[PDB]
Amino acid sequence: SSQIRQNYSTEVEAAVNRLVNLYLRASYTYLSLGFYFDRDDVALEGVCHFFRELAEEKREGAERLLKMQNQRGGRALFQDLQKPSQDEWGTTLDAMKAAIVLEKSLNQALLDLHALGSAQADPHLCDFLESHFLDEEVKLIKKMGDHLTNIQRLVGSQAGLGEYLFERLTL
Amino acid sequence: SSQIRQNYSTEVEAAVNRLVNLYLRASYTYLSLGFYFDRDDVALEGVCHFFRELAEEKREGAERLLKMQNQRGGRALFQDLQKPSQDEWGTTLDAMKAAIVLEKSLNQALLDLHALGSAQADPHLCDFLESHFLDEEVKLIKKMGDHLTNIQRLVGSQAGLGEYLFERLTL
Amino acid sequence: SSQIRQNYSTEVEAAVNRLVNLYLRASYTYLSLGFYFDRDDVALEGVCHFFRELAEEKREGAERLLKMQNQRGGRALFQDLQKPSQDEWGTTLDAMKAAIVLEKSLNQALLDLHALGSAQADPHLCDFLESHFLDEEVKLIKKMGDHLTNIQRLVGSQAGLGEYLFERLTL
Amino acid sequence: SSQIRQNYSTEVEAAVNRLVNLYLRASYTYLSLGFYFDRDDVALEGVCHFFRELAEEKREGAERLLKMQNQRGGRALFQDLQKPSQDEWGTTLDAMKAAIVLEKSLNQALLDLHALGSAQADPHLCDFLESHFLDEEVKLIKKMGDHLTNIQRLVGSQAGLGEYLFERLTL
Amino acid sequence: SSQIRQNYSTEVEAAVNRLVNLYLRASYTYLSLGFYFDRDDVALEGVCHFFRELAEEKREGAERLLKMQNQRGGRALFQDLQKPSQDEWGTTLDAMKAAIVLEKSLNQALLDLHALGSAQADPHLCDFLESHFLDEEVKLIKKMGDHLTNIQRLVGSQAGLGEYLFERLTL
Amino acid sequence: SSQIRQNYSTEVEAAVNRLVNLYLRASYTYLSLGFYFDRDDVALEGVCHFFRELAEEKREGAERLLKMQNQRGGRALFQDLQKPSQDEWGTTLDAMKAAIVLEKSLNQALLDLHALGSAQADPHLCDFLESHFLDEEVKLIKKMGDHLTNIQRLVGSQAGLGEYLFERLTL
Ligand SMILES: [Cl-]
Ligand SMILES: [Cl-]
Ligand SMILES: [Cl-]
Ligand SMILES: [Cl-]
Ligand SMILES: [Cl-]
Ligand SMILES: [Cl-]
């Protein structure tokens, strides 16, 4: 039992460890998406770079949650990281749809945890999510929605052409 | 129905559009106050500049609310902008009293919307108001109260003299 | 009655206040067009930026007219600002057509006021419109006509593709 | 009754004045701890500097609370500052334990006030504590817990040696 | 009993601890005066800054006395800090009169302690007061007397006007 | 079947994907070791930093293997990442022993894969391991052996003292 722990519920502690698992899983998914778009038979470098950058952001999320865990006197506990849901990710469109689905699930986890922190009267947890995750997630989802719209407008008749142009002129 | 929208109530969406209307109305009021104090028969440049600067701040408020609207997947809807409540604004004192009344009504709108966001369990809205409006509004109201006190001390016997001196040495 | 006013007709004064209303209305229209193209389901950033920049130019127009009003000893009077004619603006093409219609109506207001100033023998008003509005308006209308032509050439068979390319390579 | 005060409960106002008293009392305690470790018969300069720096941080806390008090239109009221609980503070270990006890009581005061602000629907107070105190307090308590652990590992057989080494290589 | 203490009377040691209490009390008084003049209904920023700066100087005085205490091998002992004599400080005039009364009492404490050090044949104490307090106190009292005279000349018929002008053009 | 693949055996391809799994698992282990030594009740910052840096190096290893996979025309395939073998890592000594065990198993995987590449007559694979992994691994193992020796010499009678000193003066 901790020298520092104050106002830090076991329920929050545990949900924080699950969120770390989710973020790491997200990182892994993006590592898989990034290297799929680096395949010689896919070869969309801008799409590759976009997903690799998200791998990194999601790893950094987990790391910030682990630091906060320790700052509040909780105990990091790690679980198995499950492999991404797919081994091949189809088109840029398919991939960006899967990424928005993923982000909406991270975002709902963030909101679920905020609500718990709020029911537990844990304002530092609530602020920590407010300052470092909730707005970042909103901005990212807006950006992906923006991309989806542009990808979709570009499919038209000429899907290859549109995929090339999006990668070259937007990403 | 939106690709991005998550945890964003129609009630919040609508209140955000009304707040945009309020901020724009406030901007307009300050544009009118600014140009009244630029009249050759009023000629108080420091008072002019103070109100023009607030016109600009309130426009920027509306713009930030419109951006957030889009970031959450809501739909901006614009209404008629009603003209300022007055065509002539009297003394610096009169004007600063009207500006504090205006700001207290914007501030109560902000607090009403925070409360709604809080009842709707919308922590991103609550944080967004916290980070960009509530403290800014408090600081502005403090500053106007400070000015009012100084204007009032300067009326004394010699109202013209006091109005000149306030504009020259404070604004 | 004014210490400074000379050769400044009540007819000009009033038409100047109406032109201010028109410019502000134009600004508002462009604010609405700008945020429509920032929607996640429209997502054309170059179109957004083009219209936001015009919001700003039209606000600055009104501000210069209000300053001149005061410089000539007239009295600024503000009216209700009516909401933009549309809540959704369709394609880039639709939007640019609406913007040219708007600008042609501002331009005819400018010319109507010049003619009045000319009938009233008010050379300072005539010069002020000449120096700060008439050429600026011509240049803007030329630019919009240029854009319209390019948008139209790009519709061809492939409307999404053409809308993307115009926004990416021209705006 | 105030020209500026809005949504600022007498209950919050009073609790803010008590928190100011607590922070100042904390400052005083740290001033006493700092000068005890500057005694020629204690002579641990790094421990001295650590506590003097906290004296300063806690004074600055009180000052920020007094500023906010005025910004919200409340009235600062000062009380007697009670002397520190001890005139001599024993070992570095003893001192750091007393400092963690102190900080946990400041931290619980902060949380109590946040809860009150939350029950009173006072989001500006809640944000102000979130932005300037709650995380700072968590970080400080983590740091003191870190120090305690290191002090404790160093006692072992050789308490003087461990106290010297901690002061020389950590503080 | 001290390894370092030489020619340092218990009578001096104790009077030094009382002087520390006096200086801290003075600091507190000035902290209260500073925040009173930051009230929105008082709003005299130059008066605020003048008193806050004295809060700081008097804290630094106490700190230098505590350092010397330790340098001579005496033992710092802290007492209760009594609250300022007033919760509201009236006009700038009232406040500056109270500050001169306060400073004259600090100054008489300094002189009383010098006399004791002189009777005890403690030249280092006498020099320490000479080098760091007696002249500083004289200069401060001269400055406050200068301010009082200027405040008094400005009351005349027009007290608000004079209070504003003093704060704007002198402080 | 690949446009680029030449002299790249399915046996190598598969072993490369398993090595990626091993490196990622190693990264995870080091992430867990790093945050254990950041606990307030462990508090050895130099040990924390040493393991976090290895988390990063092992992630970069996996990333370089995934890039090479794609460069040779193989297909990255990801598996479940198993959780670290321990939730708590004991002393610095315990941790460094576990890290050397881990590295010896990575190193044997590297050598096993080199041998396979050598039996398959795949000189590019052999060179790639030579240039980017085998020497790096040797250097790291030497460094850990160096650390182990120093940790062990420092246990002596005084284990806490030795753990503190190693972290402060070596890491
Ligand atoms: Cl799975
Ligand atoms: Cl109206
Ligand atoms: Cl209308
Ligand atoms: Cl007491
Ligand atoms: Cl008292
Ligand atoms: Cl396992």
Swiss-Prot record, chains A, B, C, D, E, F:
| One cellular component term from this protein's GO annotations in UniProt | ferritin complex
Map out region (Catalytic site for iron oxidation) in residue numbers.
53-60
Q: Which InterPro entries match?
A: Ferritin (IPR001519), Ferritin-like (IPR012347), Ferritin-like_diiron (IPR009040), Ferritin-like_SF (IPR009078), Ferritin_CS (IPR014034), Ferritin_DPS_dom (IPR008331)
Q: Does the keyword Acetylation apply?
A: yes
Tell me yes or no: is DNA damage among this UniProt entry's keywords: no
Record's superkingdom? Eukaryota
Q: Which residues bind Fe cation?
A: 53, 56-57, 60, 63
Q: Further remark, if any?
A: In horse spleen the light chain is the major chain.
Q: What does this protein do?
A: Stores iron in a soluble, non-toxic, readily available form. Important for iron homeostasis. Iron is taken up in the ferrous form and deposited as ferric hydroxides after oxidation. Also plays a role in delivery of iron to cells. Mediates iron uptake in capsule cells of the developing kidney. Delivery to lysosomes by the cargo receptor NCOA4 for autophagic degradation and release or iron.
Identify this protein by name: Ferritin light chain
Q: Which organism is it from?
A: Equus caballus (Horse)
